[PDB]
Amino acid sequence: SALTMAEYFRDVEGQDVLLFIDNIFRFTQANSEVSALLGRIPAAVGYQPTLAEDLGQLQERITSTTKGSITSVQAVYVPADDITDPAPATTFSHLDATTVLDRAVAESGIYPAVNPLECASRIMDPDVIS
Amino acid sequence: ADHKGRVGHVSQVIGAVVDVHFADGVPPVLTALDVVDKLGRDEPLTLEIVQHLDAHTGRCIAMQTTDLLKLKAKVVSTGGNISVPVGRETLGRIFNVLGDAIDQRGPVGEKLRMPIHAVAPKLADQAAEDAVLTTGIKVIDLILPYCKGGKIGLFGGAGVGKTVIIMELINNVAKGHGGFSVFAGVGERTREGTDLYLEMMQSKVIDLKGESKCVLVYGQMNEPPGARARVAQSALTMAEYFRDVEGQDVLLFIDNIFRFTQANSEVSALLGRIPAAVGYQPTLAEDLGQLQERITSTTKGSITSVQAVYVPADDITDPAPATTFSHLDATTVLDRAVAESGIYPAVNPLECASRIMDPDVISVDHYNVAQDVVQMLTKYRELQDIIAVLGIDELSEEDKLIVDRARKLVKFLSQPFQVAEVFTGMTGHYVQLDDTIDSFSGLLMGTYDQVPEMAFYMVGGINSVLEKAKKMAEEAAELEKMRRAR
Amino acid sequence: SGKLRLYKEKLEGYNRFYSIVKTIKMVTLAKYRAAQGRIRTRDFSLRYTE
Amino acid sequence: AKKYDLFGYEVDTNTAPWIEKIKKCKYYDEAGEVLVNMNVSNCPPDIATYNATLQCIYQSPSKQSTPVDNESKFCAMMDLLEEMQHRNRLKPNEESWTWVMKECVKSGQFRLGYCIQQVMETECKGCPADLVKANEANAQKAKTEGKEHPGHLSQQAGLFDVKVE
Known part of the structure; x- marks a missing residue:
């Protein structure tokens, strides 16, 4: 629903819009809860087999086209601090800049608890930045 | 027999699983069926019955792709299990699960065929006593002797000359025991299968214009699991013919045995069976047992198998290797470190093992010599550490004599193989069992304490050591004489 | 899985620890060999000191 | 056969x-x-x-x-x-290298002709005289024109004068 509103502002209004989402994981979690009752066999960990496709359709809609631009900031919950989990991992390939927070950093009094050795950015190239 | 040519119709198709309906009743399990309708298929389609759903419907596993397969398609029973050719006409040839020559080298022209699935030898057919298999290699025949009717695990990947050892064993067994060999590539890379075939033709083990001494049976990765789970049995059936009809000591190489387990696991999953621990099939022990038990030494002949084992995730407790190791009567460890030390065959004597290393089986002298060699090598390792800690001179006279004999032993366990008479240029050797025992026994006592260390490098027997030492002495004398002139 | 990798990280640390301790053994080995001369050359300076 | x-x-x-x-x-x-x-x-x-x-x-x-x-x-x-x-x-054989040398001289690449010469000298047992002379003709003509090497290579450049783009 919110993404539809942003798309309208992008296309019809031709404006540069911001789109904040918190939390995108709950979208995957909700579909897993109903997946069992839809007669679908659970996949690994216990998520629905359609985890990758459902998220992909939504994420591809969150993009900047020739008409307008959408700057999207999404918060992803890494269950039990396990970044190997299917949901957090599946979301890594649908992003241009990843900010990975670590609990150990926070426990040391460092805020924001960013682990720079795990973060990445697409525009970290001399051609784009100075 | 009564179901030869019986007609049925395809009733269900789900991937590689096909259900066939026979109006007259399903044939016996493990029966082979042929799909007559080759409408658009580029290859013939054959199915193997694995289960009976009812008195008329039977489930089967396809050995090839099930593309362009329609329901109600006609199917004809072959009259029994899968049939594979057996005889002396299969030597030097390549086959598949169905026993069809894929080398494009003309018809096989066999005189007989045998079913893939055959019951293992009864308890009354077992050999009276265990016997050693003289492989002609000093290390194998001394520190880890092979056994007739035995299954030997060749641990160690490639890059250590594994194929060379296989070819040497094939040549020596025929040379000494007059027994043939059957190689079975289960889930093997097609590229490596091609390379092995070229090497064999280059080493003349497979003589196109002469007499070959090896059969090849390849079920490759690209083939469906139904084929990879039967290729080994087909090769085993070929060996059984030589064992029984001709009464020989045959060899059966498997590359690998893990792929055989993996294939059956996939097949069981397709049927819908509930996997056991670590996702393996519940019939893991039975599947291996129905294969290994057929590999034994009977009253007519014997079949000694050299199986290449792979440990998944380097976990030796995994059910696949763990179940496999229970059937192994010997272990051969190939290590790059030894190969990088220039020792070919690259075998780690202290890492290998064998069950016939007992006086009750081998000669007492053989057992005593082997244990002495092992003890000396173990002591040599600790002395390596000690000399590193302080130095060579810090060791005792006794210990310094033991560090010289051990180095000679390590050099003496290397051997030049006749298979490499071409690409290496050095004449091969086939050391007899008794010669090896005597040579090592004399070396341990200290008789050959004057011979130079390098005289034991890449030589066969004790006479070769003496000849090399004399040549080295003559060369040294000539060089010294020439130096004095100038 | 994190639980499995927790052991893997724990075993990863022990591996580096073995290497570093191995390095210490070599460093002390050289100094042990250098100082092993005293064993030969001792026991004669302190005669009238007794 | x-x-x-x-x-x-x-x-x-x-x-x-x-x-x-x-x-x-x-x-x-x-x-x-x-x-x-x-x-x-x-x-x-x-x-x-x-x-x-x-x-x-x-x-x-x-x-x-x-x-x-x-x-x-x-x-x-x-x-x-x-x-x-x-x-x-x-x-x-000689013919194969002969064609190569003919192309080098025809294309004006006199330096590659020098390498092909020595290949022909040590392999073919002999290099055609006309091609050797015609190759040096390009070399001496190039020397006359001043174009022995690309101009940008001969320009002096200090430590900070090298533009790495």
């Missing part, structure tokens, strides 16, 4: 028709197609076939009807020589 392949199967040794096809090609890239076609027909090229291919390259107008960026006749022939020497076990 009844040559065989890796797997011991007989091979076709009648390369004459294919050579005639090669001589008909206008752009030397088409010549490569003939080599491919004969390979599929189990008729591997012989030394004569490679020599004919080199002749087409030297005598062809260009690689294709449409211009190709950075196209070089010399590179193509050298690659072909490498293919026959390493992947086919055929030793190039």
Whole structure:
């Protein structure tokens, strides 16, 4: 629903819009809860087999086209601090800049608890930045 | 027999699983069926019955792709299990699960065929006593002797000359025991299968214009699991013919045995069976047992198998290797470190093992010599550490004599193989069992304490050591004489 | 899985620890060999000191 | 004589028709197609076939009807020589190197001519006199014009004067 509103502002209004989402994981979690009752066999960990496709359709809609631009900031919950989990991992390939927070950093009094050795950015190239 | 040519119709198709309906009743399990309708298929389609759903419907596993397969398609029973050719006409040839020559080298022209699935030898057919298999290699025949009717695990990947050892064993067994060999590539890379075939033709083990001494049976990765789970049995059936009809000591190489387990696991999953621990099939022990038990030494002949084992995730407790190791009567460890030390065959004597290393089986002298060699090598390792800690001179006279004999032993366990008479240029050797025992026994006592260390490098027997030492002495004398002139 | 990798990280640390301790053994080995001369050359300076 | 392949199967040794096809090609890239076609027909090229291919390259107008960026006749022939020497076990003869030298002198690449000379000296047992002289003619003409090497190389540049872009 919110993404539809942003798309309208992008296309019809031709404006540069911001789109904040918190939390995108709950979208995957909700579909897993109903997946069992839809007669679908659970996949690994216990998520629905359609985890990758459902998220992909939504994420591809969150993009900047020739008409307008959408700057999207999404918060992803890494269950039990396990970044190997299917949901957090599946979301890594649908992003241009990843900010990975670590609990150990926070426990040391460092805020924001960013682990720079795990973060990445697409525009970290001399051609784009100075 | 009564179901030869019986007609049925395809009733269900789900991937590689096909259900066939026979109006007259399903044939016996493990029966082979042929799909007559080759409408658009580029290859013939054959199915193997694995289960009976009812008195008329039977489930089967396809050995090839099930593309362009329609329901109600006609199917004809072959009259029994899968049939594979057996005889002396299969030597030097390549086959598949169905026993069809894929080398494009003309018809096989066999005189007989045998079913893939055959019951293992009864308890009354077992050999009276265990016997050693003289492989002609000093290390194998001394520190880890092979056994007739035995299954030997060749641990160690490639890059250590594994194929060379296989070819040497094939040549020596025929040379000494007059027994043939059957190689079975289960889930093997097609590229490596091609390379092995070229090497064999280059080493003349497979003589196109002469007499070959090896059969090849390849079920490759690209083939469906139904084929990879039967290729080994087909090769085993070929060996059984030589064992029984001709009464020989045959060899059966498997590359690998893990792929055989993996294939059956996939097949069981397709049927819908509930996997056991670590996702393996519940019939893991039975599947291996129905294969290994057929590999034994009977009253007519014997079949000694050299199986290449792979440990998944380097976990030796995994059910696949763990179940496999229970059937192994010997272990051969190939290590790059030894190969990088220039020792070919690259075998780690202290890492290998064998069950016939007992006086009750081998000669007492053989057992005593082997244990002495092992003890000396173990002591040599600790002395390596000690000399590193302080130095060579810090060791005792006794210990310094033991560090010289051990180095000679390590050099003496290397051997030049006749298979490499071409690409290496050095004449091969086939050391007899008794010669090896005597040579090592004399070396341990200290008789050959004057011979130079390098005289034991890449030589066969004790006479070769003496000849090399004399040549080295003559060369040294000539060089010294020439130096004095100038 | 994190639980499995927790052991893997724990075993990863022990591996580096073995290497570093191995390095210490070599460093002390050289100094042990250098100082092993005293064993030969001792026991004669302190005669009238007794 | 009844040559065989890796797997011991007989091979076709009648390369004459294919050579005639090669001589008909206008752009030397088409010549490569003939080599491919004969390979599929189990008729591997012989030394004569490679020599004919080199002749087409030297005598062809260009690689294709449409211009190709950075196209070089010399590179193509050298690659072909490498293919026959390493992947086919055929030793190039004097004619093969002769065509290479003719291309180098014709193209004005006098330096590559020097290398081909010494290859011909040590392998072919003799290099054509006219080509050696005609190669030095380019070298001495180039020396006269001042274009021994690209101009930008001879320009002095300090530590901070090197523009790495």
